[PDB]
Symmetry: D2
Subunit: 496 residues, 4 copies
């Protein structure tokens, strides 16, 4: 690729592109063919610490934290414009690094532009409140300040998208940040740091660490100079991060995936429900925190639905994300493919049926890549691990339900709470169901939509906090009550 | 006499019940160390049963789907019962905690106002309509009760801290399980009796009594809890947060502070002396926001120290029920011993105990848990006595030269709860206030808090806020409902 | 209620004192059920109104209420709420005696009035303004919300105390001083609420009650230089006059002027529900409701079925005394109003519309002395007609057909009004599409009539200006002030030295 | 700027087309520096204004802009902002040519205008309404915020493009259709911004520009039945007339009418700062500012010192061409306006005040052909005088003394106006006390003149109705609709079956 020839291979710490302190590197792979496409620095825990201290120094200097909100918004808008300027190259880089189709990558770049633009526009819209004090002769106000130094850890599935959800509000509010992308997908994050450097930020305001979570993650979540740890990734890693953050009573924001229900009533638009069940299950080979992996279909149409879904799954076009005909790319890594494979064994052992798929494809052009066939698992129930646990692959389970009440009970019967859908032409019924689902986002007759204007996050074990919207911006602010006594008098409680 | 009718049991799923193992605990009055009452000492199985009842009640919808307006009326009824029983409640609080009766009356007036504020807020939101960027879609954000909440309160202001938690939980439609400090359960039992009189669906409210070491882990680590709200010591709070991580549970923590009281040379001097005493010694300094760290400008430091010391010598110690008392005892033998151990630390580090620093030897104080009001001088920021929260009737005094030095010293702690700036130059006070990393800053005052404004800490003083609209938000969760009003097939996957 | 009258004040309330009219003029108040004089009250002069406004101003400038804490103001408003509930029975009876509506309707009003006061009591201390992130370095920018000032409040005869509560509650919660004048023909419950407010206690001049003819004191109330907001609920022609008067001092105006409210019924509506709600929309309080569903728009496919069902039910509506439990519809308010409704029947027929049922005064012996008018359905009409375009404010509905969803919307929006309306359909998606396109302040989906303190109420187009109820209602009683402090002021040195 | 004119449109913009007046009439535009005709534009008719309003209505109902996503509407408003910055130099020159103010003042306006459009671009998609916790079981209650509808916008001659931006930005951000008419004497930058908006692209009829006499088209713009909001910035007498016309259709009005703005200087103010800011308050744009500090209130203890210092500086103010870098104050806007200012000097003297300096046209050769009026200080005056009570809107200040903080507040509030004012004192607590008591929409503490898009601007009392700028400014362009859905509808069964 033309693009890689000019892309930085280094970390960005305190205004400089720097190698790892130990000079180590890591080879980055294209999951389509398992070929090494780039080599980047693999940073140390001391590099992460230096970045955090630089972020703290920059925060205390006030160069960004005391800049006007209006000016901060103009700089965030400049980032947005660079994303659009470089839309094609960024999308290509994301497809090369993550394997998803170019069309999916273009959608991400449009969303990223809009995320930065939304937060640019929100930057100067709310500085706090005046309170009508209950104490005569006092003035009470609540001022909103940037939370401080923030550490930000992003996942491999949508690297630049998830990075934008964190960077945009942090910069808009005046925070300093240290970001570490997934060790296996750093390309677009490196590129966005180049673009941010072009816009221009005070030294130490933005920092990029590259490397293994196992090497630098503990410093990023446990350092005393951090005010907020924002992590998007796996549940076990998230819980560890939160336990680390507790050592300094540090604010945490977590987005950890889900077991997202796709509820299809017998009065759904049937062909729409089939289309959206495929979309829910198989976009990005199901490697989506909000993938519709748990299909709940009304008993009366269950057989019809399974036959239609299976017939379509057999036609899904696997291939290179750069090829126009491809509908589904490979999964991200050998380890991840192996995990998906292990879940097939679990499903069968529990008594479920692998109705279609469940193996690596044999076709010659797919043999060198990390492909896994789109899969439908039938004859399963809520007690099963395959239904309860997040596989994060191109796999859906299908369960039947008899009544609206049973659909709700089954949908809520998981440890998760991120997103889900209800399909029915009876909008009143869909609305009743939506109000009873313990999910951060519920779609009525759709699957997948998210946008900067609305908060995204989970109930239960799917996370803590929200990203996007006004609530997303609030994670990056802290409230201070300043109370002035305008006619102070001695209390005279203690003897004189 | 009040005690003769007070319940001795836990309240679980609409019934007053003993501990599952029939264990009990004797409650002590710190003024004389006498046993005043005996209550059930619950088990982790009792706490679990309460959590499961709260969950069942939440899912039934009897409270969670009640109208917000009606929920507000019930919260207002609790407020009115607090006022109705103000006398008895104040007396119980002084008996249990040792603070003066006048301090307890002030608490009861505040508690009435906390409930009343949240009663009035209950029906004032609901969420937002969003202008969706996707044509032919409707986007709304609904605010729902967070769910089942566990609430753990401290021994210093038991009913006040209980009200900060109960009021928004009930206003929003949550179910709750509360556990007061094992050593100070009396007013919390009484408020449960009063809430039962108001009337709530079975399982909506539950009271567990017992050791944090026995039931705290289940209250913070149970899968059916959606929010853990804890007010207490830093080490316990960290543990609670680690437990809450097991189920990715929301946490709200209020953990105390090392709160600065910054006195400039242009402060109203007698006001600053009065407020330094108030900051340091109300409730024998057992206040999350006590002004234990006095920072005074160098040019008036000597004058200030002499004035403060002279006043400290006159502070009247005694029974909280006696009107002349200005400062009562500290809470327990263990707590007094901890304060005593800090005096040893201070001297070993090279600081000066300028006045106090020991138990008083006056006949009427000998049987109680008294500790003299104390001033520590000749200390600096590197010392443990300056950095660590003693939570007793002790203040340190450090000098500073410039406004910049005052800010640097004030911010040089792991904490961030509250603090004050005293200066007749309001512009200067405002500049300092904007630079202090504290949840509340008072200009020419010390101690004020109220339901209308959020309270909480930066840094290691906590996570989240109590009081105000932000306090209510801890008890809500957002749901984005997106309806596609003209759905079309995407036709991405081949047919 | 006649026993309640033995203790009710007959006077105005000005600057903390119950006072008669300056010229000792009075007015006899009538019960519309039997046209009997039930009470006599003071009929104030324009000088009395001026004295009340000046007292309100003096009180406002003293700060005793305007600078009271918001939390305390809220407690006082809550005290009023509690008095409404305490006196629910007597107030409901007084309202039925004065206005003629059923006692059950009056009880519902009193429950609502309690909730209005309680809502605003709870809202009183929940704002104060905002801190702005200033774009100018070394400045502090804040927006403080203050009471608007002195407010004049003019209420209608249909729901006197309810409409009074909508104005009084936010005015007191925010710290304004007010001067209220109820409809000259229905002052009873307003006098009573002033007695109750006095019991709670407010600073002298904070609340004032003028009694009398809009033709005598209305110009002073809308045109005085010391007034900051004129809030009027009533007829369109009077409202326009009030607004023109208010312009003389560039005074804020809040107006609620009624409507021609559509009740849109699709062929997939729950049919019996739609018939029930069309009756409710048309005939509660004899149709004397700002939001009455006087304009029924029914899908052509079910128009004949609907008209027959509605007409059959209208024939069964029970007319009588509002105090009698069997009564479903009381009389209209006055001779003048009944005559106006009657004149509309002539207009309808001359335009070619059909009076399908009703359209006259009833003859029954027990109804002959009262101001009764039969519930009426007008059919075979179209949007070009005066009977369809103009607000009759009586127990009368028109019925028009529509073919499509698009035509329903076009017809519903083809009026000068914009207050409220409904859409009936089991297809909630369709109902939502229609609701988004109706130019109305409130749209009900599968309901008719609901309003409550938590949500703003008011009209698009000629139905009004501004909103009452909700947070927006409170905002009518506030004014914003931007205070900008330069914390490091420097000379500009633009002009030569 | 004369080269810029060679490419500038001379026509109105109606329903997507640049068009002449229906009667082919034109108007010559003058440069106040030399009274030379610099451009000739169409002078539209009342039928042109009506056609624009009908086009705006048609466009609104088509939904092309009103139903466009808020995010996309914001992007288009941002595009306007970027064009203002792109064309900053030419626009600033055009504004100085048309209005006479200094080029440096015009550059500052263009920077502000960019920021106004950018603020509203960023606000466009940040609301939408509220979800309400309904008090009725089994109902859903929401408040949707919609564009108000069709808006007419009338701007003043002092800051034409700035005032235009305050109106255009929120109207387009919210999805309204608009019809704008700039001051007949200063249309240049408004024509230019319409060219720039056309480049960005809006649906046909969404934006319209009428050019002409308020006396010819103002009545249609304020009195047409298809208008939902009339937004006017200008003189008090015209504003009152506009409000009275708007009343004919119960149309929302937003007015900004100027003020008698106090500049309060305590004896503990930074003295040289107060002198600098008194000059700035009085004489920027030759005092032709809605918020000019024309009414100086100075503590008696320093009044003599202050008057002498102010007068000595006023004598040094440099008058000249706004294009010349040394000029500090340009000419006034027109012959009629200069004559009005002159007539006030006669009034002042007849009332017993002293013209301490200025009060006449300057004689210098390079100023003789222009509409210059000397910077003037009037002393020995009091609150009872017309010169103190009435807005001159020229390069003139009055000076009155006060003894105490209480007297400063009483005098400052003793006018019919309520737009802006300042308090100068190093005692910030005192300045805050005074600021809280001044009945003014904006109060500056130790500053004079600041305004910005982030904070609302507008007047108490006769200075206006409503606010421009900030979130409140956006709200003038929105309307609330309460949609209440009954999710389990049941028959009421009130009326007999
Ligand atoms: Na969670
Ligand atoms: Na913290
Ligand atoms: Na209107
Ligand atoms: Na006004």
């Amino acid at each position: 690729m033309e693009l890689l020839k000019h892309l930085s291979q280094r970390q960005y710490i305190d205004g400089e592109w720097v190698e790892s302190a130990n000079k180590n590197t890591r080879d980055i792979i294209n999951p389509y063919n398992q070929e090494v496409i780039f080599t980047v620095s693999e940073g140390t825990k001391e590099d992460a610490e230096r970045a955090i201290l630089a972020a703290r120094r920059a925060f205390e200097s006030g160069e960004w934290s005391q800049e006007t909100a209006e000016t901060r918004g103009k700089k965030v808008r400049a980032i947005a414009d660079k994303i659009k300027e470089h839309r094609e190259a960024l999308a290509r880089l994301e497809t090369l690094d993550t394997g998803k189709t170019l069309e999916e990558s273009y959608a991400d770049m449009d969303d990223i532009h809009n995320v930065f633009m939304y937060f640019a526009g929100l930057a100067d819209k709310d500085g706090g409140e005046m309170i009508d004090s209950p104490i005569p002769d006092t003035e009470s106000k609540i001022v909103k300040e940037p939370v401080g130094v923030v550490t930000q850890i992003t996942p491999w599935n949508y690297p630049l998208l998830q990075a934008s959800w964190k960077i945009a509000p942090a910069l808009a509010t005046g925070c300093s940040l240290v970001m570490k992308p997934s060790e296996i997908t750093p390309l677009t994050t490196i590129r966005v740091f180049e673009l941010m450097e072009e816009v221009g930020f005070p030294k130490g305001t933005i920092n990029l660490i590259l490397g293994a979570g196992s090497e630098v993650g503990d410093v990023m979540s446990g350092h005393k100079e951090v005010d907020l740890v924002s992590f998007t990734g796996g549940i076990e890693t998230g819980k560890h991060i939160m336990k680390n953050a507790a050592n300094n009573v540090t604010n945490i924001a977590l987005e950890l995936g889900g077991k997202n229900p796709n509820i299809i009533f017998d009065d759904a638009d049937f062909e729409l429900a089939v289309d959206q069940a495929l979309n829910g299950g198989y976009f990005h080979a199901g490697q989506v925190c909000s993938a519709g992996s748990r299909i709940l279909v009304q008993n009366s149409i269950k057989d019809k639905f399974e036959q239609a879904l299976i017939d379509r799954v057999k036609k899904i076009k696997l291939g290179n994300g750069f090829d126009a005909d491809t509908e589904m790319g490979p999964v991200i890594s050998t380890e991840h493919r192996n995990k998906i494979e292990s879940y097939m064994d679990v499903a069968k052992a529990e008594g479920a049926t692998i109705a279609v798929g469940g193996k690596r494809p044999d076709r010659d052009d797919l043999k060198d890549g990390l492909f896994f066939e789109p899969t439908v698992i039938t004859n399963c129930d809520t007690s099963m691990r395959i239904v309860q646990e997040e596989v994060f692959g191109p796999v859906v389970t299908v369960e039947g339900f008899e009544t609206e009440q049973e659909a709700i009970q089954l949908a809520n019967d998981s440890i998760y709470g991120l997103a889900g859908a209800v399909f029915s032409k009876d909008i009143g019924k869909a609305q009743r169901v939506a109000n009873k689902l313990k999910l951060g986002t519920v779609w009525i007759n759709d699957f997948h939509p998210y946008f900067a204007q609305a908060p995204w996050g989970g109930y239960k074990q799917s996370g803590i906090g929200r990203e996007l919207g006004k609530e997303g911006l609030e994670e990056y602010l802290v409230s201070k009550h300043i109370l002035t006594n305008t006619n102070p008098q001695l209390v005279n409680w203690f003897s004189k």
